[PDB]
Design a binder for this molecule. Structure first.
Ligand SMILES: *[C@@H]1O[C@H](CO)[C@@H](O[C@@H]2O[C@H](CO)[C@@H](O)[C@H](O)[C@H]2NC(C)=O)[C@H](O)[C@H]1NC(C)=O
Ligand SMILES: *[C@@H]1O[C@H](CO)[C@@H](O[C@@H]2O[C@H](CO)[C@@H](O)[C@H](O)[C@H]2NC(C)=O)[C@H](O)[C@H]1NC(C)=O
Ligand SMILES: *[C@@H]1O[C@H](CO)[C@@H](O)[C@H](O)[C@H]1NC(C)=O
Ligand SMILES: *[C@@H]1O[C@H](CO)[C@@H](O)[C@H](O)[C@H]1NC(C)=O
Ligand SMILES: *[C@@H]1O[C@H](CO)[C@@H](O)[C@H](O)[C@H]1NC(C)=O
Ligand SMILES: *[C@@H]1O[C@H](CO)[C@@H](O)[C@H](O)[C@H]1NC(C)=O
Ligand SMILES: *[C@@H]1O[C@H](CO)[C@@H](O)[C@H](O)[C@H]1NC(C)=O
Ligand SMILES: *[C@@H]1O[C@H](CO)[C@@H](O)[C@H](O)[C@H]1NC(C)=O
Ligand SMILES: *[C@@H]1O[C@H](CO)[C@@H](O)[C@H](O)[C@H]1NC(C)=O
Ligand SMILES: *[C@@H]1O[C@H](CO)[C@@H](O)[C@H](O)[C@H]1NC(C)=O
Ligand SMILES: *[C@@H]1O[C@H](CO)[C@@H](O)[C@H](O)[C@H]1NC(C)=O
Ligand SMILES: *[C@@H]1O[C@H](CO)[C@@H](O)[C@H](O)[C@H]1NC(C)=O
Lengths: 420, 86, 50, 198
C-alpha cells in the first residue's frame, strides 16, 4: 500500500475564534539513549600472530600499525567512562529521600530504589536491566562506574529533584514541598499555580497512573529498549566478524599459523605467514575504524543524554520536544544497561472548547488589552482567561492595560471593564 | 578486583575521590605509598524535606567559571606522491 | 594437531566418529586422544594485559 | 592542566604526524625502507618488486593517517559547533539552559581567545546562606484563597510574608502581591492570615 502520513485534521480557523483547554492530563513518556559502549580491547600482536615468534618478527616489518590499533581502542575505552561520567555524575552530593514519602499524594515508589533488593534498583530500573573471543586476544574491560554506582548517582538525582526541585542543580539543595515545586513547574508552562493546588489530588492521581503505565508498557514491549540492544548487537557482531576472519586463508595454504610453521621452513613459511598477516592486519584495521566511527555516534548520544540531564532533570525546559511531547514539567532519570532512560512528565492540554475572541476591549473610548490572558466570549459575556487553561475571570482594570483609543485595533469589541 | 589482580597497592576501607581509575569501582592513589579503594561518588547530603518547609537564600555569590573548547585543528597537508615515492 | 594450552577432561558428548571439536571461532577447542580415546578440552594458558 | 583539552588536540595531531613519518622507516617486506638504496642496487625487473612493497605499505600508512584525521576532524567540528552555540548563547545573550553556560544561574559570559580554541568565562549567580522557613501554598482571608503573584508565602515563626523565591526579601502580604482563586476549602495546607489592603 501507499503509506499514510497521518489522519487529516482541519482546524476550525477564523479571525475571531479561539480554542481553550478546559482540562489537561499528566503524561509520562520514555526516552531511551545510549551512553556507553562495551570497552573492548584487542591485542594486535596476539590476534594476528598468536604466540608465534616467527610471525611476530614479520609483523615488526610493518612498523607501528599495531601500536596505532592498540592506542585507538584504548582511546575508545577511556571515552566510554567519560561518557558515563558526563551523563550521570552531574551531582556533587549524594542526596537521599526522607523516611516518610509524603509528597502530597505523588507516588515515586516505582522510580526510587527498592530497599528490599540487593541491587538497590527501582522497580522500573530492575525491569530495564532485565530486558537488556577472549581466547583470540579480544578482551573486555569493566566500566569504572559499576551498575550499583550508576544507580546511586541516579537515586541522588531523583532525591534532589523530588525534595529540592532544580535548586540543587544550581547551588545548594533548597528543600521545598513537592506540591509547591509542582506549582512552580505549572507557572513555568504558563499555567497559574492555583490550578495545581485546586486539582492537586487529580494531578497526583494522573501522575501516579502514568508512572504505572510506564512499567507495564516496558514489560509488555520487548522492543522498547531496542536502542540499547542495537548497540550491544552491533559490537557483538563486529567482534564475531573479527574472530571469524582468523579462519580465512587470504591466499595462504592454511588459516592456521601453526600448520604453516609445522610444515614449512622459514624461506617458504614467511611467504604464507605474510599473507595471513596482511589479511589479519587488514581485518583488524577494519574493525578499529568501525569502532571509532561507532564510538563517535555513542559519544554524540552521550552528549545528548548529558544535556538532557542538566536540562529536563536538573531544570525545567522551554525547548519543544526536547524533554518529551507536551509542556515539560519535570523529568526523572533511570539507570539502564550502557545507557540512560528518561521519564518525561509533561502537561498536555485536554478537552478544549470553542470561544469567540477579541484582540482588545473598547471601554470609555480606550483600548484595553489583557495583561496575561486572552479575551473570550461564552456567547453572552466577555471574560479574560489564561491561555493554557480555561478560567473565565471578570474583565477588570486590574487584569488589563490601556494603550491607544478604540479606532486603531482591528476587531476590537465593545464591553465593560470593571473598576474595583 | 574484577579488573584483574592488583599488586603493590594497599587496599583500604576508606573511600576517596577517584584518582587513578582501575575499574569496577576501584581507584588507586598515592597517599607515602600507593593504595586501592572503592571510589566515593560524593558526600551524602540529606535534604530537610517536609510538606511545609522551604529553604530560601538570604545571600548569593558571583561565580566565574572557565569552559575550554577546541575550535580548530592544525591544517596539515601531505603530498601523497612525495611521501610515498619522494 | 599442534598447539599450546591446558588439557582437561571434557564433558562434551563426542560421537564415535568425531576426532576433535571447534568453538564458534572455528578453532580447535577439544581433541580425542589417539591412544586412549579420552576427550580433552583445550583452553589457552592464562594470559591478559598488564 | 587547565588547558589540557586544547593540548590534547595538539598532542594527538603531532603524534599522528610523527607516526606517519616513522612509517617511512619500515621495510614492509622490502630489502630496504630507503627507496634510493633499492634503485641504486637493483634493475627495474627486480627493483619494482621491492618498490611495490614500499608503495603498498606507505600508501596504507597514509590511508590510515587520513582516515584518523577525518574522524578526529569530525570531533573538532562538533566541538566548534558547540563553541559557536555557546557564543550566540551565553555571550550574545542570557541562557535559561542549565549547566549550558556554567554551573549556577547564568548571568553573562565573556569569550577569550586561545590556541586553536576558545575559552569562556561564565558569570553565574549562586544562591548562598539559605535559611529554614515555614511555608504555605495559599493564605486564607475573608473566606477566599490568596496565592502569591510572584513569590512564595513564608513564616519566620510569628508572621507571614511573601518573598521572591531566589532571594529572601520578606514583604507584607497585600492584595497587590497576591491574587484570589476559589475559597479556603479547596487548597491543602492553606493557612489563616491577614491580607492587607492598601
Ligand atoms: C505507591 O504505589 C505502590 C504501587 O506501585 C503502592 O504499593 C502497593 O500497595 C498496595 C496496598 O495499598 C499493595 O496491595 C500492593 O501489593 C503494593 N504494590 C507494590 C508494588 O508494592 C504503595 O502503597 C503506594 N504508596 C502510597 C503512599 O500510596
Ligand atoms: C478532567 O479529566 C479528568 C481525567 O483525566 C477527570 O477525572 C476523572 O473523572 C471521571 C468521572 O467522569 C472518573 O471516573 C475518573 O476516575 C477521574 N480520573 C481521575 C484521575 O481522577 C476530571 O473530572 C476532568 N475535569 C473536568 C472539569 O472535566
Ligand atoms: C469549533 O467549531 C467547529 C465547527 O464550526 C468544529 O469543527 C470544531 O471541532 C469546534 N472546536 C471545538 C474545540 O469545539
Ligand atoms: C456566560 O457566563 C455567565 C456567567 O457564568 C452566564 O450567566 C451566562 O449564561 C453564560 N452564557 C452562555 C452562553 O453560556
Ligand atoms: C472576520 O471576517 C469577516 C468577514 O468574513 C469580517 O466581517 C469581520 O469583521 C472580521 N473580523 C475580524 C476580527 O477581523
Ligand atoms: C462601540 O460604541 C461606539 C459608540 O460609543 C460605536 O460607535 C462603535 O461602533 C461600537 N463598536 C462596536 C464594535 O460595536
Ligand atoms: C577493612 O575492613 C575489614 C572488615 O570488613 C577488615 O577485616 C580489614 O582488615 C580492613 N582493612 C583495612 C585496611 O582497614
Ligand atoms: C593401542 O591403541 C588402542 C586404541 O586404538 C588402545 O585401545 C590400546 O589399548 C592401545 N594399546 C597399547 C599397548 O597402548
Ligand atoms: C533546617 O532544619 C534542619 C533540621 O530539622 C537542618 O538539618 C537543616 O540544615 C536546616 N536548613 C536550613 C537552611 O537551615
Ligand atoms: C518576624 O518578623 C517580624 C517583623 O520584622 C518581627 O517583628 C518578628 O519578631 C519576627 N519573628 C521571628 C520569630 O523572628
Ligand atoms: C504535613 O504532614 C502532617 C503529618 O505529619 C499533617 O498533620 C499536616 O497537616 C501536613 N501539612 C501539609 C501542608 O500537608
Ligand atoms: C481559619 O478560620 C476558620 C474560621 O473562620 C476555621 O474554621 C479554619 O479551620 C481556620 N483555618 C486554619 C488553617 O486555621
Amino acid at each position: 500500500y501507499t503509506m499514510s502520513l497521518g489522519a487529516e485534521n482541519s482546524v476550525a480557523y477564523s479571525n475571531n475564534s479561539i480554542a481553550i483547554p478546559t482540562n489537561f492530563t499528566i503524561s509520562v513518556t520514555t526516552e531511551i539513549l545510549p551512553v556507553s559502549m562495551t570497552k573492548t580491547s584487542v591485542d594486535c600482536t596476539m590476534y594476528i600472530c598468536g604466540d608465534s615468534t616467527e610471525c611476530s618478527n614479520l609483523l615488526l616489518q610493518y612498523g607501528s600499525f599495531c601500536t596505532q590499533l592498540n592506542r585507538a581502542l584504548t582511546g575508545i575505552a577511556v571515552e566510554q567512562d567519560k561518557n558515563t561520567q558526563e551523563v550521570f555524575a552531574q551531582v556533587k552530593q549524594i542526596y537521599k529521600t526522607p523516611p516518610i514519602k509524603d509528597f502530597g499524594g505523588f507516588n515515586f515508589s516505582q522510580i526510587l530504589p527498592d530497599p528490599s533488593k540487593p541491587s538497590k534498583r527501582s522497580p522500573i530500573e530492575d525491569l530495564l536491566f532485565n530486558k537488556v573471543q577472549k581466547f583470540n586476544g579480544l578482551t573486555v574491560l569493566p566500566p569504572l562506574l559499576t551498575d550499583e554506582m550508576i544507580a546511586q548517582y541516579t537515586s541522588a538525582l531523583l532525591a534532589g529533584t523530588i525534595t529540592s526541585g532544580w535548586t540543587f542543580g544550581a547551588g545548594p539543595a533548597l528543600q521545598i514541598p513537592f506540591p509547591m515545586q509542582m506549582a512552580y513547574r505549572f507557572n513555568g508552562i504558563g499555567v497559574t499555580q492555583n490550578v495545581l493546588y485546586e486539582n492537586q489530588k487529580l494531578i497526583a492521581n494522573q501522575f501516579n497512573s502514568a508512572i504505572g503505565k510506564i512499567q507495564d508498557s516496558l514489560s509488555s514491549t520487548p522492543s522498547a529498549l531496542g536502542k540499547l540492544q542495537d548497540v550491544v548487537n552491533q559490537n557483538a557482531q563486529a567482534l564475531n566478524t573479527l574472530v571469524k576472519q582468523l579462519s580465512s586463508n587470504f591466499g595462504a595454504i592454511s588459516s592456521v599459523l601453526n600448520d604453516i610453521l609445522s610444515r614449512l621452513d622459514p624461506p617458504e613459511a614467511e611467504v604464507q605467514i605474510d599473507r595471513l598477516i596482511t589479511g589479519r592486519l587488514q581485518s583488524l584495521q577494519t574493525y578499529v575504524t568501525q569502532q571509532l566511527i561507532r564510538a563517535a555516534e555513542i559519544r554524540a548520544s552521550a552528549n545528548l543524554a548529558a544535556t538532557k540531564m542538566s536540562e529536563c532533570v536538573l531544570g525545567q525546559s522551554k525547548r519543544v520536544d526536547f524533554c518529551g511531547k507536551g509542556y515539560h514539567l519535570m523529568s526523572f532519570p533511570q539507570s539502564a544497561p550502557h545507557g540512560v532512560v528518561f521519564l518525561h512528565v509533561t502537561y498536555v492540554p485536554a478537552q478544549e472548547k470553542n470561544f469567540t475572541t477579541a484582540p482588545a476591549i473598547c471601554h470609555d473610548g480606550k483600548a484595553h488589552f489583557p495583561r496575561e490572558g486572552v479575551f473570550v466570549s461564552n456567547g453572552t459575556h466577555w471574560f479574560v482567561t489564561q491561555r493554557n487553561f480555561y478560567e473565565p475571570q471578570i474583565i477588570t482594570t486590574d487584569n488589563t492595560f490601556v494603550s491607544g483609543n478604540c479606532d486603531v485595533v482591528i476587531g476590537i469589541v465593545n464591553n465593560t471593564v470593571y473598576d474595583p | 578486583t574484577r579488573a584483574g589482580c592488583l599488586i603493590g597497592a594497599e587496599h583500604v576501607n576508606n573511600s576517596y575521590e577517584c584518582d587513578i581509575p582501575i575499574g569496577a569501582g576501584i581507584c588507586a592513589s598515592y597517599q607515602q605509598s600507593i593504595i586501592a579503594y572503592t571510589m566515593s561518588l560524593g558526600a551524602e547530603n540529606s535534604v530537610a524535606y517536609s510538606n511545609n518547609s522551604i529553604a530560601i537564600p538570604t545571600n548569593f555569590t558571583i561565580s566565574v567559571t572557565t569552559e575550554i573548547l577546541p575550535v580548530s585543528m592544525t591544517k596539515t597537508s601531505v603530498d601523497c606522491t612525495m611521501y610515498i615515492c619522494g | 594437531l599442534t598447539g599450546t594450552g591446558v588439557l582437561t577432561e571434557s564433558n562434551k558428548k563426542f560421537l564415535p566418529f568425531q576426532q576433535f571439536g571447534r568453538d564458534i571461532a572455528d578453532t580447535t577447542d577439544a581433541v580425542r586422544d589417539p591412544q586412549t580415546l579420552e576427550i580433552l578440552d583445550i583452553t589457552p594458558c592464562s594470559f591478559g594485559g598488564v
